[PDB]
Structure formats: C-alpha cells, structure tokens
Design an enzyme around this catalytic site. Structure first.
Site, short mmCIF file in Angstrom:
data_model
loop_
_atom_site.label_atom_id
_atom_site.label_comp_id
_atom_site.label_asym_id
_atom_site.label_seq_id
_atom_site.Cartn_x
_atom_site.Cartn_y
_atom_site.Cartn_z
N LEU A 294 27.68 -17.81 2.88
CA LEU A 294 28.48 -17.32 1.87
C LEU A 294 28.35 -16.07 1.84
CD1 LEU A 294 27.61 -20.28 -0.66
CD2 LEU A 294 29.96 -19.69 0.39
N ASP A 295 29.48 -15.25 1.13
CA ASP A 295 29.39 -13.86 0.94
C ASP A 295 28.78 -13.43 -0.32
OD1 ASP A 295 29.75 -11.33 2.41
OD2 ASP A 295 31.89 -11.50 1.98
N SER A 296 28.66 -12.05 -0.49
CA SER A 296 28.34 -11.48 -1.80
C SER A 296 29.33 -11.86 -2.99
CB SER A 296 28.32 -9.90 -1.70
OG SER A 296 29.59 -9.45 -1.58
N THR B 173 29.02 -15.77 -3.45
CA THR B 173 27.65 -16.26 -4.31
C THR B 173 28.07 -16.43 -5.73
OG1 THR B 173 26.42 -15.20 -2.84
CG2 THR B 173 25.32 -15.47 -4.77
#
Ligand SMILES: CCCCCCCCCCCCCCCCCC(=O)OC[C@H](COP(=O)(O)OCCN)OC(=O)CCCCCCCCCCCCCCCCC
Ligand SMILES: NC(=O)C1=CN([C@@H]2O[C@H](COP(=O)(O)OP(=O)(O)OC[C@H]3O[C@@H](n4cnc5c(N)ncnc54)[C@H](OP(=O)(O)O)[C@@H]3O)[C@@H](O)[C@H]2O)C=CC1
Ligand SMILES: *P(=O)(O)OCC(C)(C)[C@H](O)C(=O)NCCC(=O)NCCSC(=O)CCCCCCCCCCCCC
Ligand SMILES: CCCCCCCCCCCCO[C@@H]1O[C@H](CO)[C@@H](O[C@H]2O[C@H](CO)[C@@H](O)[C@H](O)[C@H]2O)[C@H](O)[C@H]1O
Ligand code: SF4
Lengths: 182, 80, 353, 87, 122, 36
Positions: free
Chosen positions: B36-38, B41
């Site tokens: 999952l990316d920033s 999240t």
C-alpha cells in the site's frame, strides 16, 4: 388504404377558432369570466408590491421612486422585504457570479403569479462590466424577465414607465378566459 | 482483541489497493507486506477509523503503519 | 456529432458545436412544449445554439423556457390546436417538427379524439404542406388503434394518420415518465386521498423524462431514426404498489388508499372530471388505464439503438423526493450514553443574559 | 361527574408516564383544575362565596407552583442538557 | 482558527519531512470530510466517488519536487477546505468540480485523431 | 337566542369565508417542498 373511415371527408369541414388576442367576447358565460378577470387584474394592479435586489446604483434611483416628488404609495406600490409577500422582483444593479445563486433562490421563493423587471444596462445585458470575469451578462441567463428598462441609470420616470408597461401586461392577462378556451 | 482483528481483517479484504488477499497477518506492514502507498495508508486508516467510530489524530495516525500498531491504538480507546 | 448535416430535403447545415452563443443551425418547432417533457427537449436544443419555435396557448406558462437560450433562439408563437394558420406559420421554417401535445383526460373543449387525432391531423398536414425534413410524433406506450382505452385508442390512431400523410415519421412511445415535476413520483409523493379500482396493480417499465428528453435529441441527430418506431422504457418491471413503497421508503408518508370497485368508480369518475376545472388525477378514461399493463412492442427500436442506457427509478427516488422530507430536531433518534456525557461539558442555559 | 373524570385524566397522566417529566408537570395542574372546578360547582349549589374565594387562592398557589416548578426545571436543564429519563 | 472556524495561519514548510507531514494531514482531512460534503451539497454520487475524486486532485501534484511550490499548493487546499466546510461554496461550485456534470460530459476532448477530425476538433 | 352567541357565529362565518376565497380562488401548487 385509409387511416380511419371518417377521413378524406371529415377534413373538408373543420372549425377555425381565432387566437386569444383576436378573440371577441359574447355570451353570458363569457362576460362573467371576463368580469372575474378584470376584478382580479384590478387588484393585481392596485396593490403592486415589489421585492427588490438593490445590487448597485440603480437602487438609488429606485429609492427616488419612494421619495416625495415621485411617490409609489400614491399608486399603491409598497416594496416588501420578503419574497413571500411580493408580486414582482426588480433586479436593479450589476449581477455578479457570486450574487446569482441568491438571485435564483429568491426568485424560486416568489409565490405565483410572478413578474420580474430588469432595471438598467447592467442587469439587462451586463453593461459597462459586460466584458468581465465576474459579471453575469444579463439577469435573464438566470431568471425570466418580463420588462426591460433601459438607462444607466434609468430615470425614476423611466422605472415608473416600466411599471406601467407591466401593469398594462397584467390588465391584458386573461386568467379565466384562457381556461375557458382550454 | 479477536473482534478488533476480525472487523479490520474483512475491511482490508474489500480494499482494492491491497496487492493480494491472504497476505494479511497479525503483523502485516502496510508498505512492505501489502504494497500500500503513502496515500493508500490514509485511505486504509480512515476505513480503520470509521468502522470503529473513532477519530484518529494526526499525531497518532502517522504512527499507524502496521496492523499491530492499528490494533494497539484501537484497544487504548475506551469507545468502540 | 458531425459538423455537417444534410437535411432530408437536401440542404446542408454547417454547425459550430459549442454552447449558448454557438451555431447549432437546426430550426425546431416543438408542439406541446409547456408540459413536463417539452422543457427537456427545448432546453437541449437551445443550450447548444439552435432556434426553437415554441407555440404556446398561455403567456404565463411559457416563460421558463426562454432562459435556456441566447437572444433570437427561443421564439414564441401564440397558437390554438383549432387555428390552422397559427400551426402553418409555426412550421414553415422548421427542419424538424416535434409533436408532444397530449392530454390524459377529456375537457369541455377537447375529447381525446380532438386532441390526439384532430390536432395531429391539423399539424402533420402542415408538416406535409412545407416539406419539413423530420417530423417526430411522441405517441404513448400501449398505443393500439383498437383499444378499450380512449387514450391508447386515440393516440394509436394518430400514429396511423401521422404516417398516412407523412411516411417518414418517427414514432416515440415512452413508458410512464418520472422525475422532477412529473405526475408519477410526485403523485405518490403529494396526494393523500387516492382512488383506484385495480389495487394499484399496474405493471410497467418507468423511464426517466431526462433520457426521454435526451433520446428525442438523438432522433434528430441520426438520419437513420427517420421512419421507424421507438419504445423508450426503463430497465426493470415495476408495479405501482412497488413504485409507491419506494416513495414510502424515502419520505415516510401516510396516504389513504380507497380502491373503490370499477362499476362504482368509473361512472363517478366522469362526474368529477366534468365539474372540477383542474386535473383531478382521476377521470373515466384514466381509471380504465389502470387495468391495462404495458406491453413492449418487439418490432420497435429501443434506447440501445440510440446508444443510450435507461436508468431505473430506484436509483433516483432519493434525489427527486429529498425536497419532500420533513426532518427537524424532533424526529431525531434517542441519544446514546457517550453523547449524553458530552452534554455535561456544556452549560445549556445563559444565566447572565 | 366531569370533575371526577378530569381528576382521572391527571392520575392517568402519572400512570402512562415513564419519560415525560413535563407531563408530570402538566398532570399536577390538570388535578388542580379538577379540585378547583369541583369546589366551584358545589359553591353554586350552596349559595356560598367562600367556595369561590377558595378557588381563587387555589389558582394563585397553582401559578406559584408553576413558577417554582419551571424555575427548578430550568436549573436542572442548565447542568443536564436534557429533560429525558434514561430507561 | 481565531477569526474563522477552519482558519490556518499561513506557514512556510521548514523542510520535506515537514512538507510531507502537512500534505498527508491535508489529504486525511479531505477524505475524512467526504461524507459531510456529500450531505450538505447533496452530491448525487457515492462517498467513494467523492473520495476517489479527491485523491485525483492530490495525485496531480505528486511529482512536485519544489518546496516553494508545495506551500502554495497546500494553502490553496486549506482555503478550499475552509470554504467547503463552512457552507460558503454553493452546491453549483462544488458539484462543478466533478467534470461529468457538463452537458457534454467527461468526454470533452476528442479521443483520438479521427474522431476529433470528423467532429471539427470536438 | 342571545346576542353574544349570534355575534361569535357571525365572526366565525366571516373568518371561514376569507378561507373560502383563498382555498377556492387562489392557485394551489401541490409541491409543498439541528443544533444546540
Ligand atoms: C364561473 C365559472 C363558470 C363555468 C361554467 C361551466 C364551464 C364548464 O363547462 O367547465 C367544465 C369544467 C370541467 O373542467 P374542464 O375545463 O372541462 O377540464 C379540465 C379538467 N377537468 O367544470 C367547471 O369548471 C364547471 C364548474 C365551475 C365551478 C367549480
Ligand atoms: N408523461 C408520461 O407519463 C407519458 C406521457 N406521454 C405523452 O407524452 C406527451 C408529453 O408528455 P407530458 O410532457 O407529460 O405532457 P403534459 O400533459 O405535461 O403536457 C402536454 C402538452 O400538450 C399541450 N396540450 C394538451 N392538450 C392540448 C390541446 N388540446 N391543444 C393544445 N395544446 C395542448 C399542453 O399545453 P397546455 O399546458 O397549455 O395544455 C402541454 O404543453 C403527451 O402526449 C403525453 O400524453 C406518453 C406516455 C407517458
Ligand atoms: P507517498 O509518499 O507516495 O506520497 C506523499 C506525497 C504526495 C506527499 C509525495 O511524497 C510528495 O512528496 N509529493 C509532492 C508534494 C505534494 O503532493 N504537493 C501538493 C500537496 S497539496 C495538494 O495536492 C492539494 C490538492 C487539492 C486539494 C483539494 C482536494 C479536494 C478538492 C475538491 C473536493 C471535492 C469537491 C468539494
Ligand atoms: C372549509 C369549507 C369547505 C372547503 C371550501 C374550499 C374548498 C377548496 C377545494 C376546491 C378548490 C381547489 O383549488 C384547486 O385545487 C387544485 C388541487 O389542489 C389545484 O390544482 C392544481 O394542482 C393539481 C394537482 O393534482 C393539478 O392537477 C392542477 O392542474 C393544478 O391546477 C388548483 O390550483 C386549486 O386552485
Ligand atoms: S446600470 Fe448603471 S446605474 Fe445601474 S447598477 Fe449598473 S452601472 Fe449602476
């Protein structure tokens, strides 16, 4: 081939009703509905209560219609704050994109019957600020208009003249005589 | 503690940005494990947040990078 | 979609495709434009730069239609369905003519025969008199020349006379339409004392007026729609009682359903229509309409043929019924213990004011 | 007979009330309107003015309980934010 | 928030750790607020469509590698947040951010060469 | 009958009539369309 049996002979004889402007008046029923109109129109004319959007300078000239030299009260005009108590909206002033949602909201709250007067060049077609990013080019891109009064600003006589044009439009409004033709 | 996993676990199951289901463990990391990316999240923790009807503060949400950290924050909050 | 349109007669149009100030170059005459459907066809042509001739009977009613167009675009003509000159001069310049004129009830001046036949006659004869390119006749669903319903009969006979004299007529048979300012959802929304004689058991395929308004635009833009019949309807079968519970499920309204048998309701229906001057929503022919169910013509083209998807009415009830939702602080649910505690951090009285 | 029925109404307001401390305020006043009303109708029967006067002083004490009752209910609401009874 | 409910004093990011912290807090507030934006503005879209569309507006500036450019892009967001959470923007401004409520719709550029040629540049 | 009775009924009739003109003659559009 035939669409229905009565055709090609029924079309020979059909009646021609003149349009309402050229319609005459004759009969007891017709007079009676006409009287109901004239009385109704007399009261829509005698009590002429305008809700107003004094956006800019044209409102000053609408204030001089309430002062002693030209008094609105002598003709029955009383400016009401609420749209619910009003008959006609007078858009007097430059309409901006920020002001337009509140113009449509206020007009949407006017109980029927409804009339709108556009007063001045700015409301009529944009005027001096027609070529701007913030101005609506005419208040009739937002609401329907019934009379346009010219001038920047129109004289107080000119706005009176526009009210008389509208009062004449109502005197020519057929209410119970239109329901009778259909 | 079993419920706070069960409701979270099914939540990430329907989350599309998760690379593949069945990678969800008790210690699954949002970036390393689930991919999952920033900004994925924040979307997850918001689902984490809303499902349990509590508002995560920023000082605490920046700490929610692994599932176990998410668990230990929700237990500390008296309401659920 | 193309910038060039060769009309059915042969003249070319070179349109510039933009918005209000643009050049649609289509001239349109919409008969029946002051009802609920006509404001969608009028607005769609006008807002893209086309002249729309709007014949009207009442001055006040027509006013909302002018806002949609720039100067010189919405032209208003005073017309009567029994004055042929008014009809003639409304269609002499038109490229496409629409006919949306139609009642659901007889009047003291028009029998369903007079409206749907004697008007379609009088109007299509003008379309043929000036070689108008496209003529689009909006008929009804369940239109059939031999029907016990005068609405399905007289509207079915108009479809005959339309192509007898104008073989290149588009027919459009829409299902009961729904949406803003309709007589379908707003009826179930607004009325309280409701009379039926078939247990609200009508089954049909409700369609959004907005796709009907958009579809009528595309019949103008595709030359291949000329000369065939369309059946516009939604995606799911519905019954009136199933439609009402959707209205019920959104607004929480209690209404009286009387459901008086057909023998004691229809003879009474004529009377109320003959003495009340407004559309009372029940009349003799309207009650007979309750017993039929919509039957979809299998030989008629549909939304898909126009590249369109109908939407169902369930996806729209919340939108068109939200204005009718009495929700004050009273109707709110009983409070929870967590928020009852929150109230102890506030003072709920101002003891110094 | 109307006096007794209207007394029951005030009683029954106490029978059916699990949540309204306002209806408890109301039913006390319905009960007072019964008793004052009974005193008055018997005073007309006996040609006595003292029954009329006793009604007057019941009406004046009744208004004073409303002031004390709504005043105390205000003091409670300021710290509570709710007149509701959790049940 | 002294003068107004969602006011934030104009601040200049000290470094990239600070600047990324602020971006994430901005995105968090927006996607938190999406249910509140969808009832007030009566948006006829799922909260999911609103949230996925909020994401696109941050996804546009994901490759900015200038710190002076991020602060103006953050101030623009904060001001947009303030005028949306206070009912200052009209439904017309808000649901005009969704670029499918045009009568031409989302499809407003030509798809390829030929379809824009046959329509005269769209 | 007494005069006070006929007087209230008369006013009651007038008050109803002004409703009748409104409900008969005025147009009637069917469309009739949280903090501490
Ligand atoms: C003063 C009014 C005088 C009216 C004379 C009678 C006119 C007449 O025959 O009107 C018929 C009308 C029935 O209504 P109609 O206009 O036919 O259709 C609309 C939907 N019912 O019915 C009426 O309006 C007649 C009864 C009028 C009073 C109610
Ligand atoms: N809406 C629906 O559920 C369905 C409707 N249809 C048909 O679609 C058409 C349009 O629908 P809709 O917009 O709902 O219709 P409306 O009843 O809302 O409007 C009908 C239009 O016809 C005009 N009109 C009616 N009778 C006459 C007459 N005797 N002379 C002149 N003009 C007349 C009306 O003008 P005015 O207001 O002055 O009377 C109005 O502009 C109608 O033919 C309708 O029957 C078909 C199937 C379902
Ligand atoms: P991850 O580490 O992969 O990504 C984190 C970020 C994005 C910070 C990157 O690491 C990064 O450094 N990118 C460059 C910095 C950056 O993103 N700059 C811009 C930030 S402000 C911004 O993008 C504002 C966007 C618009 C704000 C409003 C959005 C919603 C408006 C409409 C709502 C719907 C109608 C009311
Ligand atoms: C208390 C004494 C006894 C009652 C006396 C008063 C009776 C009032 C009822 C009769 C007059 C009804 O008044 C009339 O109502 C109808 C229906 O709402 C309205 O009718 C309007 O809405 C209906 C909704 O179905 C439309 O179909 C109709 O085309 C439209 O004109 C009229 O605009 C209004 O003028
Ligand atoms: S029309 Fe002239 S006077 Fe009126 S508001 Fe505009 S600028 Fe002012």
């Amino acid at each position: 081939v035939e669409p229905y049996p009565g055709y090609e002979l029924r079309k020979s004889l059909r009646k021609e009703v003149p349009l309402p402007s050229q319609e005459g008046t004759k009969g007891l029923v017709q007079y009676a509905l006409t009287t109901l109109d004239i009385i109704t129109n007399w009261a829509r004319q005698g009590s002429f209560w305008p809700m107003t959007f004094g956006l800019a300078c044209c409102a000053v000239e609408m204030m001089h219609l309430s002062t002693p030299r030209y008094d609105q009260d002598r003709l029955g005009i009383i400016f009401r704050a609420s749209p619910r108590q009003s008959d006609v909206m007078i858009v007097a002033g430059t309409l901006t994109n920020k002001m337009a949602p509140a113009l449509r909201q206020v007009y949407d709250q006017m109980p029927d019957p409804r009339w709108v007067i556009s007063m001045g060049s700015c409301a009529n077609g944009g005027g001096y600020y027609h070529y701007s990013y913030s101005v609506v080019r005419g208040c009739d891109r937002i609401v329907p208009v019934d009379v346009y009064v010219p001038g920047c600003p129109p004289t107080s006589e000119a706005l009176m003249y526009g009210i008389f044009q509208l009062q004449r439009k109502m005197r020519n409004t057929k209410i119970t005589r239109m329901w009778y033709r259909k | 503690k079993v419920e706070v996993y069960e409701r979270i676990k099914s939540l990430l199951a329907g989350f599309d940005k998760v690379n593949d289901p069945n990678n969800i463990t008790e210690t699954a990391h949002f970036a390393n494990d689930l991919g999952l990316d920033s900004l994925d999240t924040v979307e997850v923790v918001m689902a984490i947040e809303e499902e349990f009807s509590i508002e995560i503060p920023d000082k605490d949400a920046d700490q929610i990078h692994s599932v176990d950290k998410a668990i230990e924050y929700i237990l500390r909050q008296p309401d659920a | 979609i193309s910038d060039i349109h060769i009309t059915r007669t042969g003249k070319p149009l070179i349109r510039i495709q933009g918005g209000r100030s643009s050049l649609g170059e289509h001239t349109a005459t919409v008969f029946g434009a002051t009802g609920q459907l006509g404001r969608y066809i009028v607005n769609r042509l006008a807002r893209q730069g086309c002249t729309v001739i709007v014949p009207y009977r009442e001055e006040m009613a027509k006013r909302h239609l002018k806002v949609s167009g720039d100067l010189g675009r919405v032209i208003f003509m005073e017309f009567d369905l029994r004055n042929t000159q008014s009809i003639e001069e409304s269609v002499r310049h038109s490229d496409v003519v629409y006919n949306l004129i139609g009642r659901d009830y007889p009047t003291k001046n028009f029998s369903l025969a007079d409206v749907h036949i004697e008007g379609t006659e009088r109007i299509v004869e003008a379309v043929a008199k000036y070689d108008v390119d496209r003529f689009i006749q909006v008929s009804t669903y369940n239109a059939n020349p031999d029907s016990t319903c005068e609405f399905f009969r007289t509207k079915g006979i108009a479809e005959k006379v339309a192509r007898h004299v104008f073989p290149e007529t588009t027919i459009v048979r829409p299902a009961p339409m729904f949406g803003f300012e309709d007589r379908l959802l707003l009826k179930l929304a607004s009325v309280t004392n409701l009379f039926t004689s078939n247990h609200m058991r009508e089954k049909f395929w409700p369609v959004h007026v907005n796709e009907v308004g958009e579809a009528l635009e595309r019949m103008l833009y595709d030359d291949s729609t000329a000369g065939q019949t369309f059946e516009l309807y939604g995606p799911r079968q519905y019954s009136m009682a199933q439609i009402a519970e959707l209205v019920d499920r959104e607004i929480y309204k209690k209404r009286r359903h009387i459901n008086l048998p057909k023998p004691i309701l229809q003879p009474l229906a004529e009377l109320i229509n003959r003495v009340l001057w407004w559309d009372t929503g029940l009349s003799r022919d309207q009650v007979e309409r309750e017993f039929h169910d919509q039957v979809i013509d299998p030989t008629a083209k549909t939304f898909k043929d126009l590249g369109m998807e109908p939407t169902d009415i369930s996806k729209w009830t919340y939108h068109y019924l939200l204005p009718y939702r009495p929700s004050t602080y009273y109707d709110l649910p009983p409070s929870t213990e967590k928020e009852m505690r929150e109230e102890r951090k506030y003072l709920h009285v101002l003891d110094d004011q | 007979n109307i006096t007794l029925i209207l007394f029951l109404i005030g009683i029954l307001g106490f029978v059916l009330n699990r949540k309204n401390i306002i209806l408890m305020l109301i039913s006390i006043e319905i009960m007072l309107l019964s008793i004052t009303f009974l005193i008055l109708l018997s005073s007309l029967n006996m040609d006595d003015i003292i029954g009329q006067t006793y009604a007057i002083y019941i009406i004046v004490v009744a208004g004073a309980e409303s002031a004390i009752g709504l005043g105390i209910l205000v003091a409670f609401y300021r710290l509570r934010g709710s007149i509701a009874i959790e049940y | 928030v002294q003068p107004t409910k969602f006011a934030v004093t104009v601040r200049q990011s000290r470094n990239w750790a600070d600047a990324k912290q602020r971006v994430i807090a901005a995105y968090r507030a927006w996607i938190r607020a999406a249910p509140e934006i969808q009832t007030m503005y009566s948006i006829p879209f799922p909260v999911s469509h609103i949230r996925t569309r909020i994401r696109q507006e941050f996804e546009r500036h994901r490759y900015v590698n200038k710190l002076n450019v991020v602060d103006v892009l953050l101030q623009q967001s904060n001001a947009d947040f303030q005028e949306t959470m206070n009912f200052w923007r009209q439904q017309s401004h808000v649901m005009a951010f969704f670029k499918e409520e045009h009568f031409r719709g989302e499809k407003r550029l030509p798809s390829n060469f030929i379809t824009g040629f046959l329509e005269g540049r769209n | 009958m007494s005069a006070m009775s006929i007087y209230i009924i008369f006013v009651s009739i007038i008050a109803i009539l002004f409703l009748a003109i409104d409900l008969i003659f005025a147009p009637h559009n069917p469309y009739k369309e949280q903090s501490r």
